[PDB]
Amino acid sequence: VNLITRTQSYTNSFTRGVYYPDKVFRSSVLHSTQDLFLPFFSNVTWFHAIHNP
Amino acid sequence: EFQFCNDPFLDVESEFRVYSSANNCTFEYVSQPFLM
Amino acid sequence: TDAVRDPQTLEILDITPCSFGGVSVITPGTNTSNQVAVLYQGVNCTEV
Ligand SMILES: *[C@@H]1O[C@H](CO)[C@@H](O)[C@H](O)[C@H]1NC(C)=O
Ligand SMILES: *[C@@H]1O[C@H](CO)[C@@H](O)[C@H](O)[C@H]1NC(C)=O
């Protein structure tokens, strides 16, 4: 059955989305990682679902 | 190999409306909940 | 690699290379004498 309606807005990611690439402990160091990251200050779709989604 | 409805949603207590039929699986994992 | 968790019991330990260094030989002229001194460089004398 269909009972969900979606509403789209746009917001700013700021500096959210940083994760630990590998489980290798590192203390007091600046490390460079090439990985799939959420770019800083990106447009993040904010979806409201009220009850093709 | 689930086939879902075009508007899948959980019923809570059951899982009938999410997937109509279930068949041959490939993986499964039961652990502590993600959301607290 | 400086720290490792023990697989059997979860305890964080530090693995570090133990004593090593260079060795210098202090000698007078070989015509003066054959006595020498050895300088173990960078290591505390309890380690040697
Ligand atoms: C980008 O983000 C701003 C701030 O949320 C928003 O006003 C703008 O519409 C967004 N642009 C698009 C359409 O991605
Ligand atoms: C070297 O060994 C002596 C032994 O008495 C000790 O007093 C000193 O603290 C040691 N120094 C270092 C850097 O380990």
Resolution value, angstrom units: 2.6
Ligand 2 pocket member C48 (CB < 6 A) = no
Using a 6 Å cutoff on CB, does residue C41 contact ligand 2? no
Nearest CA to ligand 2 atom 5: C46
Residue B17 DSSP code: T
Counting CB pairs under 8 A, whether chains C and B reach 3 or more, is no
Query: How many whole angstroms separate alpha carbon B10 and alpha carbon A53?
Result: 15
> Position of tokens 């133990």?
C18
Expt. technique: cryo-EM
Residues C37/C40/C43/C47 CA torsion (nearest 10 deg):
-70
Angle at alpha carbon of residue A53, lines to A51 and B32, rounded to 5°:
75
Whether A41 lines ligand 1, by a CB cut-off of 6 Å, is no
Measure in Å the smallest separation between the Cα of B27 and chain A Cα atoms.
24
